[PDB]
Amino acid sequence: FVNKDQIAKDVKQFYDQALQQAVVDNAKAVVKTFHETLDCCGSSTLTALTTSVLKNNLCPSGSNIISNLFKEDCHQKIDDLFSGKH
Amino acid sequence: FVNKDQIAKDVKQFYDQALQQAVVDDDANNAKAVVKTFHETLDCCGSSTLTALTTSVLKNNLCPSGSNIISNLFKEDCHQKIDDLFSGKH
Numbered sequence: 001f002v003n004k005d006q007i008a009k010d011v012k013q014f015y016d017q018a019l020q021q022a023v024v025d026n027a028k029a030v031v032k033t034f035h036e037t038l039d040c041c042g043s044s045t046l047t048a049l050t051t052s053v054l055k056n057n058l059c060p061s062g063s064n065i066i067s068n069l070f071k072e073d074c075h076q077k078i079d080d081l082f083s084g085k086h
Numbered sequence: 087f088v089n090k091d092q093i094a095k096d097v098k099q100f101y102d103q104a105l106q107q108a109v110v111d112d113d114a115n116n117a118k119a120v121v122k123t124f125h126e127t128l129d130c131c132g133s134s135t136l137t138a139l140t141t142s143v144l145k146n147n148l149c150p151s152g153s154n155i156i157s158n159l160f161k162e163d164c165h166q167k168i169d170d171l172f173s174g175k176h
Contacts, residue, residue, distance in 0.1 A: 010088070010096065011097070037127060037171060081123060084118075084121075
């Protein structure tokens with residue numbers, strides 16, 4: 001069976017790789033899709049790439065977004081999706 | 087190395103394991119919260135691998151308010167929405 005924690009880890013790895021990818025040179029669109037779907041912007045583990053996404057308009061316009069930028073970041077949202085608490 | 091095609095196949099399977107337990111298991115509260123969070127999150131109700139369970143999914147109040155058999159026939163299913171997420175559409 002697919003295990004919850006395993007798939008969560010895989011998806012946060014996937015997201016982290018698109019964030020890294022979007023900063024250079026499909027990654028921008030995957031990053032924007034994650035941010036808009038999960039209502040987050042970046043990762044507490046990747047502060048510089050998060051600065052890049054805010055500087056490049058790759059985050060959703062919610063002041064709720066900014067107030068929970070790192071308090072409820074895309075790793076937490078991915079965990080919440082797989083836990084049924086998003 | 088990240089494998090997007092494996093990850094999307096694994097997400098679709100996770101969803102179908104939750105949906106199947108949600109309909110048969112009366113106290114699977116985590117499975118029902120997983121399916122309801124996928125449906126609210128991705129704007130979908132049911133999957134193409136489980137077309138015959140949509141009736142049941144609806145009756146168990148697992149889809150967002152508004153969903154019903156007719157409206158749901160004119161929407162993409164959850165697998166397609168999972169694929170849209172990993173391809174940067176959604």
